[PDB]
Design a protein around this ligand. Structure first.
Ligand SMILES: [Zn+2]
Lengths: 93, 85, 109, 275, 559, 279
């Protein structure tokens, strides 16, 4: 999931990770010892928060279909660069 | 009357030409202040010191007490008279 | 002549407006040049500021000033200095060779 | 009859060599031999300048080193350009950098060896940006006293040239020649392209510093404007009391402009770059 | 649109001379070449529709509408109607104010008693030789000034502007006075005083066409016997001076002198002379041998090649002079050769008024202030009067915003050529130009005062130049000198009270020995121009006929 | 290991004039010569160097000619001139590479323990910075084959060791101290954008015809530093920026109202003075 709700609830963890509520904390403190993900996990809602991670090895279908992020970035930061410059166009001066 | 009013009023709009006269004054001031700033190359070579002069004399000469030195009759300029010293 | 004199009123206003235009781009150009000047005002200087001392002024921003090297001199000064500040024999500062006064410092020693 | 309004086609690279060696040589003066071409009469061209051995010398003529020049020329022939030496180079980084005695010896000791070998002197210490302090002269000898000397075969070159203590006290034997830089676009292109591209944030995607800078900026802004703001209290010159208005109310605004300008710039670049 | 126009030129009774001054007034508010020639060819035909025929209409439409066949038709009316005494307008305006290219084409179209006076008006030598008679009979010298300026002769302007002085006083006196009075003052000759000491004979002998060769009997090209070719080259240049616009075979004889297997020792002056001689005639042979003069790779004759080739290709629109002179421009290893080619490719396109825009944009496209300076000369010659803002906006942009002052100088020389028509507004714009920060452009503003306000009765220009000679730059003081000489041509003391002030004041500042001789460089020349003719003659940049006089324009801009 | 060297434009001009040399003497195309330098630290200076008379055969790029009389011999004459800028490396023109670069640099490795080759630019047309340096590297693989020596991007930048612009500045005749932001903005944008376009085309090649380096060693962690912000939901940063723009507009408002008052007072003073006290 690239999307947000990076303050994930513990629920998918305790369902699909074959772990319990008393051991999600060890599940991510042992990962703090590992050092590939360092979440700021919520503990008033018990939510397992997502910070930066070590992503994958290969997604060749997403190495091809990363255009929806790469070309997204390219043409959209390009277009909004053209828009900022186009609103400040004739102070080229 | 029919087609004879607007350009007279256009020459009236040469108050904008008077605005150009004002900006002309402006750029005059600026160009000549910058000329003043250009003058400053003179300020790189010699802040000529005060040489004392015992007295004047003819042959366009004086008795200059070269202050950190002795007296050595030396040259003059072509601006002031001999008696002026 | 409504079909001559009146019409002739534009025979020169075109160049009029063209020069009124060009005064603006030349304001721009002269501003460039003035910025260049202000740049060159103080970029070589104020690093090896030698110290003498003021002694006497003759004309605008020009003064005979006691040295600390062994030879008092009558040099010109940076005009922007407040004219009511060159009165004392305070810590003036000039270039080594040019001996061009840049500013005077109150304290010393 | 070389009496003309003459010219020298310098090579900026040789200028770089001269500044390179005199800039940080011994406190004394340096001197060497040119490498260019006596291309014409009313002008001349220069391309190359070698560095000189460090033998204890000066503006003396007899500073010749045979094997040095031999190997240098042999390597240059093995290199791209086997062009002939036509003069000499030299500097005066120490003193007031003018055509001293041994110059008024070597320039004739070699201008007979050479044909012109126009002077080359420069003092790097006298300027870094302000002046271009350098010297160059075609020596005159006591034989040219035949007629009234006004070469000026063209004008406004020796005319614009109308614009040195002992050397203007030595205009005899020392008449200066109009100089110029080469049409350097061949490199001037790469002399600005690489410069502008780098000297301006290189990649330029870097500050696009933006807070700690304006903190101190606005922080000192609240401390700076409150003195120039005392000038209207001094502009309390009501009846007749005002000389120059202490026209220093500026020199802070433009800075304030730049400050909040960049503030808005970065505010933009945030939402612009970030997505 | 010519519907109400045709109903109101075939209209009813007023003075028909309404339409006669309306010719010049339509020309005063004219913007295009599109109904200019239309109205210009239909008003002459509505004068052919009105029963009273007119001659001022053809006096104007020959020099604005360039029809060599309608003048042949009404010149058969001059042979048939037989009145030579009414014929003066068309005949000697055809001699006076016609383009030399149009002169050759019109003597081509015309020949198909006035049976031989039809050829005698086109050669028109009568006014030439009685003008020469005036130039020998009338005189008013000031020789004391000639001695007190003779005290500061060098390889300099004194050696040239003494003969410029008494030769603009006397264009063809056919008499020696500076040859006669001395030889040792004449013995300060070194290559340009040598070039001048043999070219000055034809300087002082403008006109006087037949006795050119037999007056330079001493100056045939083996009869100098000098250890230098300039003392024999300026003489053939002086033949080129005499043989201006009316040669015969001697154009081809200077051509053959260049082609008597002689490289760049005869060409030294003879190539300048040949290009000056066949000017605007659009020859072929001079282009053929000036191509190897162009490819000499020596600018002492190469600038003569570029200048002389522009001279012989005046306003050409050639497909090979323009392209084959812009081609050699880039890969040459000098740029005074580019000054030569610069003024040459300026002169190759004169007055086209919309055509040369590709060339101006192509050359001001480039980065070279010398080549952009060439572009400004070329836009001074393609545009003169036509302030359509196409030749003003970007002209003024590059004129005053640019970084090198020489192209800026050529642009403020272009201003005086595009502002000839109404010099009323020209003080109000060039006094603004005065405010410049830089030496060449201070001087060029002075030159804009000079060549712009030549014939004017302005006092504000004098008021401008007085602080301009109160200026530490010496040659802007000479700009004040020479430009005020150009404001003191044609006019006397009753015109403005600064005339005799400056007349004695220039000798007064030449009394000061410690001035630069660059400060008084053209002071002898300011005295000479100050009596150009002795106020007998004047500039002709825009003739009283209505049409510009292009060899005078050539003279001033190469001058 | 070098993060930067003094890329002194004097050696740039040397390179340029000897490229003019290799162009005018004939058809020798790839400008290649010896880079000289003084190893002060990881940082270094490149102000002096030279081109060596060398030729590369069309096939078998491992063809080169490095005269000892034009290098080793010259080095001794240059040793008496200045021993500092020692033999440090070399360079080559041509955008990507040829096959010999590695063998050349390893031959000269005896001279400089960290010898460098530099892809030199003969035509400044770049978006950014010209020629960069590549020192000896041992970077084979996770496979860890016999150590490849394709010299990695040993970063550096245009070091101007000394000003010496007494002439250099005297050459520009074009620019001022640009008190320009818009220039920076357009450059930065378009450069990021064309870079990303090169990226997407390279990766479309990877999917299509790209080799095993399709995701070689970092291209995935390339995407991870992209994954720094992987709408990014900067809502924390949204109200953060809300207070930030509170600060921004406080700055704008206060400072620019000050500016208003500032010009107002004295500009109007001078205005009214020269206006009514003139008449
Ligand atoms: Zn020396």
């Amino acid at each position: 999931r690239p999307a947000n709700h990076r303050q994930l609830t513990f629920e998918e963890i305790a369902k699909s990770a074959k772990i319990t509520v008393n051991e999600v904390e060890l599940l991510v403190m042992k990962a703090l010892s590992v050092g590939l993900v360092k979440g700021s996990i919520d503990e008033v809602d018990k939510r397992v928060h997502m910070t930066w991670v070590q992503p994958r090895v290969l997604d060749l279908q997403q190495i091809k279909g990363m255009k929806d992020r790469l070309e997204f970035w390219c043409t959209d930061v390009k277009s909004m660069e053209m828009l900022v410059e186009h609103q400040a166009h004739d102070i080229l001066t | 009357y029919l087609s004879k009013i607007e350009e007279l009023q256009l020459i009236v709009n040469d108050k904008s030409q008077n605005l150009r006269r004002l900006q002309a004054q402006r750029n005059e001031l600026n160009a000549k202040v910058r000329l003043l700033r250009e003058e400053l190359q003179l300020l790189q070579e010699q802040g000529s010191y005060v040489g004392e002069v015992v007295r004047a004399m003819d042959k366009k000469k004086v008795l200059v007490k070269v202050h950190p030195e002795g007296k050595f009759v030396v040259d003059v300029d072509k601006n002031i008279d001999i008696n002026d010293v | 002549d409504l079909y001559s004199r009146y019409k002739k009123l534009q025979q020169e206003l075109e160049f009029l407006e063209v020069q009124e235009e060009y005064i603006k781009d030349e304001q721009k150009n002269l501003k460039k040049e003035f910025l260049h000047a202000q740049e060159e005002v103080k970029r070589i200087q104020s690093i090896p500021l030698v110290i003498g001392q003021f002694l006497e002024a003759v004309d605008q921003n020009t003064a005979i000033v006691g040295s600390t090297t062994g030879s008092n001199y009558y040099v010109r000064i940076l005009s922007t200095i407040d004219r009511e500040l060159l009165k004392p024999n305070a810590s003036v500062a000039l270039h080594k060779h040019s001996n061009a006064l840049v500013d005077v410092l109150p304290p010393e020693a | 009859a070389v009496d003309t309004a003459e010219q020298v086609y310098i090579s900026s690279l040789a200028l770089l060599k001269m500044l390179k060696h005199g800039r940080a040589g011994v406190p004394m003066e340096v001197m060497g031999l040119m490498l260019g071409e006596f291309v014409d009469d009313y002008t001349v061209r220069v391309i190359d300048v070698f560095a000189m051995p460090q033998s204890g010398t000066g503006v003396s003529v007899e500073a010749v080193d045979p094997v040095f020049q031999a190997k240098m020329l042999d390597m240059l022939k093995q290199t791209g350009r086997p062009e002939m030496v036509v003069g000499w180079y030299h500097s005066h980084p120490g003193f007031g950098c003018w055509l001293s005695g041994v110059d008024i010896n070597t320039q004739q000791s070699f201008e007979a060896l050479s044909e012109r070998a126009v002077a080359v002197v420069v003092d790097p210490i006298q300027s870094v940006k302000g002046k271009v302090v350098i010297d160059a002269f075609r020596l005159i000898n006591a034989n040219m006293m035949v007629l009234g000397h006004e070469p000026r075969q063209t004008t406004s070159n020796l005319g614009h040239l109308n614009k040195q203590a002992l050397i203007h006290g030595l205009n005899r034997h020392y008449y200066s020649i109009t100089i110029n830089y080469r049409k350097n676009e061949l490199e001037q292109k790469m002399l600005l392209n690489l410069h502008k591209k780098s000297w301006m944030e290189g990649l330029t995607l870097q500050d696009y510093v933006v807070k700690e800078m304006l903190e101190l900026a606005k922080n000192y802004n609240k401390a700076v404007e409150e003195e120039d703001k005392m000038t209207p209290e001094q502009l309390a010159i009501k009846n007749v009391g005002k000389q120059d208005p202490k026209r220093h109310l500026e020199e802070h605004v433009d800075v304030l402009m730049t400050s909040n300008i960049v503030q808005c710039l970065a505010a933009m670049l945030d939402t612009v770059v970030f997505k | 649109r010519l519907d109400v126009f045709e109903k109101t030129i075939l209209e009813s009774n007023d003075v028909p001379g309404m339409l006669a001054y309306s010719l010049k007034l339509c020309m005063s508010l004219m913007q295009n070449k599109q109904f200019r020639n239309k109205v210009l060819r239909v008003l002459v035909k509505i004068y052919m529709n009105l029963e009273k025929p007119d001659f001022i209409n053809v006096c104007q439409c020959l020099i604005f509408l360039d029809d060599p066949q309608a003048v042949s038709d009404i010149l058969e009316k001059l042979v048939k109607e037989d009145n030579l005494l009414m014929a003066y307008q068309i005949c000697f305006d055809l001699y006076e104010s016609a383009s030399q290219q149009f002169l050759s084409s019109v003597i081509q179209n015309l020949r198909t008693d006035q049976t031989l006076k039809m050829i005698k008006i086109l050669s028109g030598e009568m006014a030439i030789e009685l003008h020469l008679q005036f130039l020998i009979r009338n005189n008013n010298t000031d020789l004391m000034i000639l001695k007190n300026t003779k005290d500061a002769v060098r390889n300099s302007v004194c050696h040239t502007a003494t003969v410029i002085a008494n030769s603009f006083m006397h264009c063809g006196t056919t008499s020696d006075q500076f040859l006669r009075d001395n030889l040792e003052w004449l013995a300060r000759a070194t290559n340009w005083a040598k070039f001048t000491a043999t070219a000055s004979l034809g300087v002082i002998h403008k006109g006087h066409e037949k006795e050119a060769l037999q007056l330079m009997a001493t100056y045939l090209p083996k009869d100098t016997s000098p250890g230098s070719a300039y003392q024999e080259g300026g003489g053939l240049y002086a033949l080129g001076l005499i043989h201006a616009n009316h040669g015969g075979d001697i154009i081809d004889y200077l051509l053959n002198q260049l082609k008597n297997a002689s490289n760049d020792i005869v060409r030294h002056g003879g190539s300048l002379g040949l290009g000056l001689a066949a000017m605007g005639t659009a020859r072929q042979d001079v282009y053929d041998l000036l191509k190897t003069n162009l490819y000499q790779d020596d600018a002492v004759t190469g600038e003569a090649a570029g200048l002389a080739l522009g001279l012989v290709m005046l306003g050409s629109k050639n497909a090979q002079a323009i392209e084959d002179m812009v081609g050699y421009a880039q890969e040459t290893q000098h740029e005074k050769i580019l000054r030569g080619l610069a003024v040459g490719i300026a002169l190759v396109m004169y007055g086209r008024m919309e055509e040369a825009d590709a060339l101006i944009e192509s050359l001001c496209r480039d980065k070279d202030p010398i080549l952009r300076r060439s572009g400004m000369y070329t836009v001074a010659m393609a545009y003169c009067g036509s302030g359509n803002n196409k030749a003003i906006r970007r002209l003024l942009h590059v004129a005053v915003s640019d970084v090198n002052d020489d192209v800026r100088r050529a642009a403020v020389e272009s201003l005086g050529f595009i502002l000839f028509r109404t010099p009323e507004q020209c003080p109000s714009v060039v006094s603004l130009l005065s405010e410049s920060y830089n030496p060449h452009v201070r001087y060029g503003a002075a030159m804009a005062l000079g060549i712009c306000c030549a014939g004017t009765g302005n006092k504000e220009a004098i008021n401008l130049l007085e602080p301009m000679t109160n200026d530490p730059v010496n040659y802007v003081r000479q700009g004040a000198l020479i430009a005020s000489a150009l404001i003191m041509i044609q006019q006397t003391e009753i015109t403005c009270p600064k005339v005799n002030q400056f007349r004695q004041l220039y000798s007064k500042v030449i009394n000061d020995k410690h001035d630069d001789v660059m400060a008084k460089f053209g002071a002898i020349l300011a005295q000479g121009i100050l009596d150009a003719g002795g106020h007998n003659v004047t500039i002709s940049l825009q003739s009283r006929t209505g049409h510009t006089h292009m060899p005078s324009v050539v003279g001033v801009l190469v001058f | 290991a070098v993060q930067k060297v003094v890329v002194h434009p004097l050696v740039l001009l040397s390179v340029v004039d000897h490229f003019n040399r290799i162009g005018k003497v004939g058809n020798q195309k790839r400008v290649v010569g010896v880079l000289l330098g003084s190893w002060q630290k990881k940082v270094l200076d490149v102000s002096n160097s030279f081109a060596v008379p060398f030729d590369e055969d069309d096939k078998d790029d491992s063809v080169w000619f490095l005269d000892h009389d034009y290098l080793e011999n010259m080095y001794g004459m240059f040793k008496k001139v200045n021993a500092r800028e020692r033999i440090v490396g070399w360079y080559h023109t041509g955008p990507k590479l040829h096959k010999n670069d590695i063998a050349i640099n390893e031959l000269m490795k005896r001279y400089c323990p960290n010898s460098v080759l530099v892809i030199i630019d003969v035509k400044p047309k770049d978006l950014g910075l010209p020629t960069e340096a590549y020192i000896s590297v041992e970077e084979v693989h996770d496979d860890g084959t016999p150590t490849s020596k394709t010299f990695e991007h040993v970063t550096s930048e245009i070091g101007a060791e000394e000003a010496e612009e007494v002439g250099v500045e005297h050459l520009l005749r074009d620019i001022k101290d640009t008190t320009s932001q818009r220039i920076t903005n357009q450059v930065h944008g378009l450069k990021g954008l064309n870079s990303k376009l090169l990226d997407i085309r390279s990766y479309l090649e990877k999917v299509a015809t790209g080799k095993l380096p399709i995701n070689h060693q970092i291209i995935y962690q390339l995407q991870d530093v992209f994954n720094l912000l992987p709408l990014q939901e900067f809502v924390k940063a949204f109200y953060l920026k809300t207070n930030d723009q509170m600060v921004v507009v406080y700055l704008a408002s206060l400072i620019r109202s000050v500016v208003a008052l500032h010009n107002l007072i004295n500009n109007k003073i001078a205005n009214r003075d020269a206006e009514k006290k003139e008449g």
